[PDB]
Amino acid sequence: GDERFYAEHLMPTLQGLLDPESAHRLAVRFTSLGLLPFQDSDMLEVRVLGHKFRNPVGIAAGFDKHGEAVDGLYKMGFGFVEIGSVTPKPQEGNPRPRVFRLPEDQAVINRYGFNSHGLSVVEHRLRARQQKQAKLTEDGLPLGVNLGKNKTSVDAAEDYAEGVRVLGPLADYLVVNVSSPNTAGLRSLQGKAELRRLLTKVLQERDGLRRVHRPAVLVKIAPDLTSQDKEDIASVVKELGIDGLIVTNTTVSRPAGLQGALRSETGGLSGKPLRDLSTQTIREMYALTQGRVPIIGVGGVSSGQDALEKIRAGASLVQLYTALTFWGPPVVGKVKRELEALLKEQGFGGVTDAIGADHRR
Numbered sequence: 001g002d003e004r005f006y007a008e009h010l011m012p013t014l015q016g017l018l019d020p021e022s023a024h025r026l027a028v029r030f031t032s033l034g035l036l037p038f039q040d041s042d043m044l045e046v047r048v049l050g051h052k053f054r055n056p057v058g059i060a061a062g063f064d065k066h067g068e069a070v071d072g073l074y075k076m077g078f079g080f081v082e083i084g085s086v087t088p089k090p091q092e093g094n095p096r097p098r099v100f101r102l103p104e105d106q107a108v109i110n111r112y113g114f115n116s117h118g119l120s121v122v123e124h125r126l127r128a129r130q131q132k133q134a135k136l137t138e139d140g141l142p143l144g145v146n147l148g149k150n151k152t153s154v155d156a157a158e159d160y161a162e163g164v165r166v167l168g169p170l171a172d173y174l175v176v177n178v179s180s181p182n183t184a185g186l187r188s189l190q191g192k193a194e195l196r197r198l199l200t201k202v203l204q205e206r207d208g209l210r211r212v213h214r215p216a217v218l219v220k221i222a223p224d225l226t227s228q229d230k231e232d233i234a235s236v237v238k239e240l241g242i243d244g245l246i247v248t249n250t251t252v253s254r255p256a257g258l259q260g261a262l263r264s265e266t267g268g269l270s271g272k273p274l275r276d277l278s279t280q281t282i283r284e285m286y287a288l289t290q291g292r293v294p295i296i297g298v299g300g301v302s303s304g305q306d307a308l309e310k311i312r313a314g315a316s317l318v319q320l321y322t323a324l325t326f327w328g329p330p331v332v333g334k335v336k337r338e339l340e341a342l343l344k345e346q347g348f349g350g351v352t353d354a355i356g357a358d359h360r361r
């Protein structure tokens, strides 16, 4: 598992032979079969959300939408895996092409539109390995399940409620994905009144599950929120005792300077141009919640430095996806090795010490 070989040869060859969606599909297949190319220091261990995480580097939602490659992802070195988004009924998502690479920007634009095998299919897939997962979780390798809603659903809150009922018993944490830019009306669920009503329902459903089957609940937010939007979210999160936030989803913005020919495709932008917009959103959300609400930081993480910036901004854990599509599997060990070195260099005893450190200087 050599970084240079993957970065300069394997990935560019793969990217030259297949369209992005096909490459994604082959990636999932290959990962699930456990054919793949770092020993985690105690310094990387984090305890949050009612769990031990052996390292703070997770695979973000969208790579394994249907829960097919969970074990292969742990083998890749991820400290935690998040699957989804999963919708109640199966649905196909948007017409193809719907994923686009911007290699000059180390970015991706996607408009998948919640292509999902649906709750029932994912439920059975997770049930087939439920005890294996119980042991992985106990070993410090938790599982997150990200919930979406169907395109034609009338009642968004009932879609999330159904997700809580069906996959909640199989998850260490649930994500109420209220931030996809690719489902009409979805991001409006981030508004105060809508959000309070939605999350009240979600939390009631979650609280009705048996103790050993009772997941933490997080809300995943956009990087495109107004100051007022962020204030309102922070307020609702604290009012309801939401367990954490995932910050951030993809951006509908197109930062000045994008070079990719495909920069004006519709969809969510991910990877390097998102990085600091995401970090700044983490920083604001951490301040508005007084450091009391765990944050999973996501967006543009490709290095130890990227990870530590999000951690010092207030993230307890980080995730990546887009970097894997450029650098391949060696990126996971790279991020971890670099993060470990930076923690030592900056005088932190471990990840935990660094969480929110920028707010204390």
Ligand SMILES: Cc1cc2nc3c(=O)[nH]c(=O)nc-3n(C[C@H](O)[C@H](O)[C@H](O)COP(=O)(O)O)c2cc1C
Pocket (backbone or CB within 6 Å): 060, 061, 062, 063, 065, 084, 085, 099, 108, 110, 112, 114, 146, 177, 180, 220, 248, 249, 250, 270, 271, 272, 274, 298, 299, 300, 301, 319, 320, 321, 322, 323
């Ligand atoms: C192809 C693609 C599909 C995604 N699908 C989902 C999704 O289903 N649900 C979700 O919450 N986030 C989804 N995301 C967003 C990622 O989870 C993450 O928030 C975002 O891509 C920023 O991280 P990154 O720059 O490391 O990719 C997707 C991202 C991409 C690249």
Ligand SMILES: CCOc1cccc(-c2ccc(NC(=O)/C(C#N)=C(/C)O)cc2)c1
Pocket (backbone or CB within 6 Å): 010, 019, 020, 021, 023, 024, 027, 028, 030, 031, 036, 063, 099, 100, 101, 108, 324, 325, 326, 328, 329
């Ligand atoms: C020889 C195998 O190397 C691997 C092993 C496991 C995964 C990967 C790999 C992971 C993700 C991707 N994904 C993409 O390239 C992509 C795009 N565009 C998306 C949307 O996932 C491709 C390859 C490559």
Ligand SMILES: O=C(O)c1cc(=O)[nH]c(=O)[nH]1
Pocket (backbone or CB within 6 Å): 062, 085, 110, 111, 112, 113, 114, 115, 177, 179, 180, 181, 182, 249, 250, 268
């Ligand atoms: O399915 C998608 O289109 C999608 C969902 C999401 O939450 N974020 C994203 O970038 N794409």
